[PDB]
Amino acid sequence: RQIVVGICSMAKKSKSKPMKEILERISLFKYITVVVFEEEVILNEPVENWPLCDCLISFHSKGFPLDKAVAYAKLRNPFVINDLNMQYLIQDRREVYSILQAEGILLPRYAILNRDPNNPKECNLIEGEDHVEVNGEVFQKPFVEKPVSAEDHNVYIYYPTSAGGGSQRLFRKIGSRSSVYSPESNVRKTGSYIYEEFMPTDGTDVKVYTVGPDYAHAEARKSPALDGKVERDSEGKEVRYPVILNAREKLIAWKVCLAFKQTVCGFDLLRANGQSYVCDVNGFSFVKNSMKYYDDCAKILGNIVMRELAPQFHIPWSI
């Protein structure tokens, strides 16, 4: 009899190349069978009809019924790789930053502007031509403005008058672009936002991908905070740069993975001013186009499953 690992996510994710690469490798474990829950079943069937599993790998993305995944986990009590309730919090940048602070993790100085959509002028914002004051806290330009929804990627950077003013509007990468300059110098006046200090990097962001708290792959890409043209190679793949995490950063990854209870977890680091600042925690995310990562990730995940469950299945497993 096999230990069943259930994969529960939207089809765009469950059928993605990186997912398939990892699942084929997990299936190589003699005592593990992988079951990928059909999207039609996730959306349309009650949880009582979902397939059984002993270990559940499940994560929210656009369109995913997290309430149902939570109810399923409560019903069946599988070993859960990425905690489901924490995925409600990962959707809200305010909650993410609160957790990071509680863990003593360095992050940009920030302030939350909560705006009542019925009374949008009543919020705690004062605006000058070269700064904002949010709950009384001053942010001189350049500063960053992020929608409180972590699913909203319309992050704006505001340039100081000394640099010509205006703003950089970032967005989910569309073909050749990740951002565009706007002459608009004043901040958005509807919605709630986090305002934060701009951290000067060498022009790259470091992307970190954990598989448990003791494995983290990192790589760098050109910051969209720059001009916004995406760098691509011959095959049309976005250019990435090699990164090795230092001791401080390996600890950050350990903390993020455990604090958010996401075994598989992606987050962003800004290397600025001799330190490394977390600016974004995304939860479930795989590295793409690395055979070594696919090998390592599947081995780690299978080993986690076996360590946890081999005893109750009476399967021999050493340490």
Sequence ranges of the binding site for substrate: 12-13, 172-173, 207, 221, 285-288
Does residue 279 belong to the site contacting ligand ADP (CB under 6 A)?
A: yes
Does residue 223 belong to the site contacting ligand ADP (CB under 6 A)?
A: yes
Does residue 92 belong to the site contacting ligand ADP (CB under 6 A)?
A: no
Q: Which does 306 bind (CB under 5 to 8 A by kind): Mg ion, ligand ADP, none?
A: none
Does residue 205 belong to the site contacting ligand ADP (CB under 6 A)?
A: yes
Q: Which does 253 bind (CB under 5 to 8 A by kind): ligand ADP, Mg ion, none?
A: none
Task: Write out the DSSP string of 134-182.
Answer: ETTEEEESSEEEEESBTT----EEE--GGGT--EEEEEEEETTEEEEEE
CA distance 225 to 155: 9
Q: Which does 27 bind (CB under 5 to 8 A by kind): ligand ADP, Mg ion, none?
A: Mg ion
> Site residues for ligand ADP, window 167-186 (CB under 6 A)?
170
178, 168, 291, 294: which is closest to 232 by C-alpha?
A: 178
CA distance 33 to 24: 10
Phi, psi dihedral angles at 93 (to 5 degrees): -60, -30
Q: Which does 32 bind (CB under 5 to 8 A by kind): Mg ion, ligand ADP, none?
A: Mg ion
Question: Percentages helix, strand, coil for the chain, rounded to the nearest 5?
Answer: 30, 30, 40
Q: Which does 144 bind (CB under 5 to 8 A by kind): ligand ADP, Mg ion, none?
A: ligand ADP
Residue pair 59/87 in contact (Cβ under 8 Å)? The answer is yes
Does residue 21 belong to the site contacting ligand ADP (CB under 6 A)?
A: no
CA distance 100 to 164: 34
Does residue 282 belong to the site contacting Mg ion (CB under 5 A)?
A: yes
Does residue 152 belong to the site contacting Mg ion (CB under 5 A)?
A: no
Q: What angle, 0 to 180 degrees and rounded to 10, lies between the N-to-C axes of helices 93-102 and 247-259?
A: 120
Residue positions forming the annotated binding site for ATP: 93, 146, 153, 172, 196-199, 205-207, 223, 268, 280-282
Residue pair 308/79 in contact (Cβ under 8 Å)? The answer is yes
Residue owning tokens 């009374």: 119
Q: Which of 269, 280, 297, 298 forms a contact with Mg ion (CB under 5 A)?
A: 280
Which residue's CB is nearer to ligand ADP, number 51 or number 147? Answer: 147
Does residue 145 belong to the site contacting ligand ADP (CB under 6 A)?
A: no
What is the number of the residue whose Cβ is closest to ligand ADP?
280
Least distance (Å) from ligand ADP to the CB of residue 71? 27
Q: Which of 83, 95, 268, 308 forms a contact with Mg ion (CB under 5 A)?
A: 268
**Strand 3-8, strand 32-36: pairing:** parallel
Does residue 302 belong to the site contacting ligand ADP (CB under 6 A)?
A: no
**Peptide bond just before 120 cis, omega within 30 deg:** no
Binding range to Mg ion, per CB under 5 A, among 30-38, 68-76, 184-192, 222-230: 30-38
Does residue 256 belong to the site contacting ligand ADP (CB under 6 A)?
A: no
CA distance 256 to 107: 12
Does residue 27 belong to the site contacting Mg ion (CB under 5 A)?
A: yes
CA distance 41 to 46: 8
Binding range to ligand ADP, per CB under 6 A, among 35-43, 45-53, 120-128, 145-153: 145-153
